[PDB]
Amino acid sequence: YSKSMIENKVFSSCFKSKNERVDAYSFACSSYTDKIEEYLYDPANSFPYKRGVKLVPKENSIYVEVGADTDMYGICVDVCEFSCTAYVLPITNNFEGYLVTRNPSIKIGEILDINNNGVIIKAGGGPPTAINIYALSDSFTINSINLIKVAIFGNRGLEKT
């Protein structure tokens, strides 16, 4: 898929709850001194936008591919499809923003984990979580893709259950 996604016959119809857009600005709270890196991504394997990515050093360049929490390099916050370039916030930096999830029913304050597809899921799935992820809001569906506001702050000392 894509982020921008088209001519319309008519325009689409308060200030509240207007941020529920797939192409919304990922950082709920931004900050200067946040490190952002550029990498290449596979244009036919998996679309890394708003997903946890890992570094795959290929024979021609270092790419980023959707990955699990065990081998996560960071979070892909934006993509330039013209150059097929992914922008990554390293895991060493804090993040507070909207990410792609696969569970349409997640409550606030729950512990979360990133799966092999770079997707937010409940931490009770069984895999030992290695990152501190907490749900700051209930998951909402855009009609279909599920998004959720999360706070990610570093790695977890001892893997939980």
Add this chain to the structure above:
Amino acid sequence: MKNPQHDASLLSNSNEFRDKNVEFFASGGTRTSKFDKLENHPFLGYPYKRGVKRVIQSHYEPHVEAGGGEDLYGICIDIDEFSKTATIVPITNNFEGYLVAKDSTVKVKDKLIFNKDGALEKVTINATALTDAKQISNEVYLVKVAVFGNK
């Protein structure tokens, strides 16, 4: 309180430039970089110079309170009483400064963990003590540490 505002009748003699920085009112850190990330958050209690955890629930936005362990979120380095806010250095950012210690047992070269009350106690590891615990007043002990994360 960070700055207990009390009126005095005589000026206090302050001329020596040594042993003047180890005090409960000295906010911030001993060494600070321009590229350090700071976040202001609503707080409950008084988590000043302590490890802070983020508590999430009329529904209100998540706040922070003194805590540690698996729930450790950051360190409170400064406080504003009027706005009832706390400046926090996230756990992903290293910090060097004086923090609250549980007791006087902490010495140099000691690995320290944030307890459930946000105080540094000897042994995941979170900090390495740089100096011995010093009693500012009553049971308040301040220790210089260099936070590096969680093991």
Add this chain to the structure above:
Amino acid sequence: ALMKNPQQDSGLLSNSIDFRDQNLIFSNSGGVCTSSKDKIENYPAKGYPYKRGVKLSFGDGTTELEVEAGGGDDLYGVCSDIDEFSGMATVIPITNNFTGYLTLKKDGQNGVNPGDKLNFNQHGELEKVKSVNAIALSKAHKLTEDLFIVLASVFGNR
């Protein structure tokens, strides 16, 4: 070896005609791809921890702490540059990710390939695999019979 710059002089003038494979020198301090928002510290240097993992070393108490080559459960950062006149070592904290050329252990260096997970030994040398996330992005390059360097990306603690 024990100096970032070649201790001995040279009897030749550089050609400076090609642009490929010119960054393999040991004097290439700093990172290869650096961000302006990187937190950088400096510390007194005990030994020569250049291009190695550095850990805190204390004394009796009469003198301030310093940094020495090391790793494992005591790793504190990575040294990327050294000012010899002042004896000062530039340190990038482990909480800040780094990408650059680092010293590689001369044991199984041929087995090191891009994508191989690495870790720091007790002497600050990168070794093929625990608690520190480091990934090799190239192969080992030989500068001296005992000196090998590898491009690595360190991105925090496991």
